[PDB]
Amino acid sequence: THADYLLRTGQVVDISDTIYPRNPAMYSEEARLKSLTPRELASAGLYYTGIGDQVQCFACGGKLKNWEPGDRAWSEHRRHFPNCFFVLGRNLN
């Protein structure tokens, strides 16, 4: 199969390294802390979107909002995006 062809010839490659982080601009924590404990969220790689209490991850691009008391940034981040590089520890940029 064309598919089998592409594989045997080693043309198939994981391009995650060109898709993530979804937002290079919010790569840095400081850049994050720029635009819910700020110092905490930013530390979980989440940056504010300007709407309600809705933040987004620079890595996966996931969105979190409507934070309830007791919600620790980082814990929520991986609960909803357990496959996120930042969450996983996979290299970024």
For another protein, the binding residues (CB under 8 A) are 3-4, 7-19, 60-62, 80-85, 88-91
Cα separation, 18 vs 16, in Å, equals: 5
The distance of closest approach from Cβ of residue 65 to Zn ion in the complex, given in angstroms and rounded to an integer, is 14
By a kind-dependent CB cut-off of 5 to 8 A, residue 16 interacts, out of Zn ion, another protein, none, with another protein
Q: Which two tokens stand for residue 20?
A: 């993530």
Query: In angstroms, how far is CA 56 from the centroid of its own chain?
Result: 8
By a kind-dependent CB cut-off of 5 to 8 A, residue 14 interacts, out of another protein, Zn ion, none, with another protein
Return the sign of the alpha-carbon dihedral for residues 27, 32, 36, 41: positive
Q: Closer CB to another protein, residue 36 or residue 88? A: 88
